[PDB]
Amino acid sequence: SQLHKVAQRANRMLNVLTEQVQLQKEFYQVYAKAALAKLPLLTRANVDYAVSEMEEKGYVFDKRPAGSSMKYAMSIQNIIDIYEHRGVPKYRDRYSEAYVIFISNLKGGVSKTVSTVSLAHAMRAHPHLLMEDLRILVIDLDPQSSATMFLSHKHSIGIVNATSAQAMLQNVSREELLEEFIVPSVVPGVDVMPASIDDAFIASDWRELCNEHLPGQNIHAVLKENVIDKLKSDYDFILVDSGPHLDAFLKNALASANILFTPLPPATVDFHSSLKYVARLPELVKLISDEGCECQLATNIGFMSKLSNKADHKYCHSLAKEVFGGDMLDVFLPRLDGFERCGESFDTVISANPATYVGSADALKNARIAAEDFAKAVFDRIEFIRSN
Amino acid sequence: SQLHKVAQRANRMLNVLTEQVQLQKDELHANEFYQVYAKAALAKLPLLTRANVDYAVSEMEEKGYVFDKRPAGSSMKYAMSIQNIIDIYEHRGVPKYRDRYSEAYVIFISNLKGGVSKTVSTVSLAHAMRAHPHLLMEDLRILVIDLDPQSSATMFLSHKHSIGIVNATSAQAMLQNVSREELLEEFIVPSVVPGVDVMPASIDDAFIASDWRELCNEHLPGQNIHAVLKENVIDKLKSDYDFILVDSGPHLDAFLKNALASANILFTPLPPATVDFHSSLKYVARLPELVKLISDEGCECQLATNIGFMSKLSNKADHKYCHSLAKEVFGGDMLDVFLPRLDGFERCGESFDTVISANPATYVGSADALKNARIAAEDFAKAVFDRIEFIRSN
Ligand SMILES: Nc1ncnc2c1ncn2[C@@H]1O[C@H](COP(=O)(O)OP(=O)(O)O)[C@@H](O)[C@H]1O
Ligand SMILES: Nc1ncnc2c1ncn2[C@@H]1O[C@H](COP(=O)(O)OP(=O)(O)O)[C@@H](O)[C@H]1O
Ligand SMILES: Nc1ncnc2c1ncn2[C@@H]1O[C@H](COP(=O)(O)OP(=O)(O)O)[C@@H](O)[C@H]1O
Ligand SMILES: Nc1ncnc2c1ncn2[C@@H]1O[C@H](COP(=O)(O)OP(=O)(O)O)[C@@H](O)[C@H]1O
Ligand SMILES: [Mg+2]
Ligand SMILES: [Mg+2]
């Protein structure tokens, strides 16, 4: 019974490791005052007018020493406050309930996680969307916790116990969710409900686990009802990311989504595997419905992901347009060195500090712009869907 | 309901692309594996000498055996393939592995924490043992059973256009319960290295894992749901392979339980980062419980032991520390060799090549890098082979 023998030493080392991590436990972006004029609706004159009026009222802007005289170091919140002061409404002023996005595809490694966390940070901080003052939550439902690691700071969560899966089973109050399950990401305004390796055991025993702690509740509606419905007034966008496993987490994510996006890989074979997922989607929803709840799933938008300037890639892109037609996004996510490098250190191209970036400055810049163009394209497609 | 319309079109496009893929398929040739040895280098191998190699070659040629030769400047020179070397050992009367072990030994490199190298380790172990310079006299027959719908093992083992669109998968074989002969002819496919075969996987298997219980009750009425891989596949191929390695995704589902119930031994790749190592130890502590659950609902696992090894290890300060903790946890069951993080592995990984199969004439990296990683795979495979020999012979 040596498995027990090694298992017991393992159990003891865990407590030793947990102590080592708990004994170890920021956005870089600021704007010069003059730089705000480049933003929509702002001018050098109206920014100075709003700034002086706010300071007269008592507001204090962030500043940082610039050699001799000290200068304004506008944070994203400072900019958002300036738009508010000037009477520009926020996104929540026209939509009164969180919209749920699920970037999904049974084929793994196609960028579900990177496009998810990039979309969240880039919508928040997009130059043209700051006036929208977006509140965004990313719910991680993959036990591998890739979204969690991208959104938090290494020595911030350390060992996570309160996970999205735990919240689903415990069925707590809006207040407890906000206070004990949700954690802020590196970019203020974007939050994450983390995941951990222990959730793999939760997924495995979902049936029985639901009978015990959630007697009578439909097994596919647990995330929507015990978590998302309680946070509907606290966020403008809620993005769910799960692993590629066709299990309870994936089904609960599907049942809670308002819209789906499918990242489409460009290599003929990966594209082929992705189409099988696209072809069986209606089958999965039917299955969910027939045995419980209905998905208020609007449409499924496709976008090429990790696209390169290669004959075969352009060819599959041609085929994707044919398959998705109108539901094809006009913007794609290019394969770029910036995404690759940031991916290595679990940074989003929006959160990576350019001063620390171990790579070409241009590569980081180009990737940020790609993420911004993709986020703007997604935001506008969603605006069209919700405005009609 | 445009969801149905997009699906319809996706389906039509699928059929189109299937045909286009099938037409591009290129049949694989066993005599194409790149590795060849100079006749003179054979004397460096175990049990061979300059004189007994010269005698063996001459005696074999006299019986009609023909060794390939290639122009090398001023003369044509022998280009010895691994099969030619295996045949020289046989000519000399050296027994093979199957002459002392008559049933396949099942290995499962497992860990619920993902990206720890379960796949690259499995695939590198399979190719590197078969083609290890010091294990050629064993003439090994190795099968890799891919049970991950993402099919990473399948991709590493085959050539892009050698396999085509996959339908006959490991998961399908488990449900169809076909004969030994049908498995050998319709499901098993050869990898780029002769002697190492693969039972492939495909994205469709994700639906099979999800509906497992209903599918078993329907296609396999009355059979224990944890005993399917062992009884419908592996037990039938026991005389056909020396080692059978199983690779599944990092999901606690039927494929992983079926692999556990089938293995003779387990290896746990242990990642070097504190938190990853931490997630791995949670898996190691829960193993007994996993095995116990399977025992309670059906079959008993015959898992000998669980050997741990450091994977993607770097000569770093923090890594050295976790390596110490791993020793304390696994103790005598820690392998002495580790798989280091190396650019060769990373580059080969991007093109789904094994560092054993990668042709140095095509490698888009430094020659030293590929060579270093090939040697690291060979050292790891020999250590694993030696450890299993000790267990099986004592
Ligand atoms: N556009 C891109 N360009 C370059 N690398 C990318 C891009 N999108 C994702 N990646 C990288 O590809 C891998 C797979 O992406 P990931 O988001 O984890 O996929 P899923 O979430 O599909 O498994 C990661 O290692 C990631 O850093
Ligand atoms: N924000 C995060 N939260 C949790 N885990 C993380 C985070 N960022 C990275 N990780 C995990 O920790 C590891 C850190 O890599 P490592 O090379 O040890 O880092 P450093 O060199 O930062 O110690 C990764 O392989 C990953 O599994
Ligand atoms: N020793 C290594 N050095 C460098 N890269 C490695 C090494 N082992 C694995 N990798 C790379 O790490 C990734 C994860 O390995 P993989 O075998 O797929 O893990 P699992 O099978 O753990 O999901 C792949 O991109 C792979 O090529
Ligand atoms: N042996 C294989 N069998 C099936 N799919 C493979 C195999 N080797 C690689 N692949 C898949 O095909 C892709 C090949 O990359 P890609 O950039 O399209 O290649 P090329 O540029 O070779 O067309 C990988 O991302 C992987 O998903
Ligand atoms: Mg992911
Ligand atoms: Mg794998």
Curated annotation (Swiss-Prot), chain B:
Pfam families per the UniProt record, alphabetical: AAA_31, HTH_54
GO biological process assignments: plasmid partitioning
Keyword Nucleus in record: no
Record GO terms (molecular function): identical protein binding
InterPro entries the UniProt entry points to: AAA_dom, DNA_Partitioning_ATPase, HTH_54, P-loop_NTPase
Keyword field contains RNA-binding: no
Keywords: Plasmid, Plasmid partition
Top-level taxon: Bacteria
Ranges in a coiled coil: none
CDD domains for the chain: ParAB_family (cd02042)
Cross-referenced PANTHER family: P-LOOP CONTAINING NUCLEOSIDE TRIPHOSPHATE HYDROLASE (PTHR13696), PLASMID PARTITION PROTEIN A (PTHR13696:SF98)
UniProt similarity note: Belongs to the ParA family.
Function per UniProt: This protein is essential for plasmid partition. It ensures the proper distribution of newly replicated plasmids to daughter cells during cell division. ParA is trans-acting.
Name of this chain's protein: Plasmid partition protein A
Species name: Escherichia coli
Lineage of the organism: Bacteria, Pseudomonadati, Pseudomonadota, Gammaproteobacteria, Enterobacterales
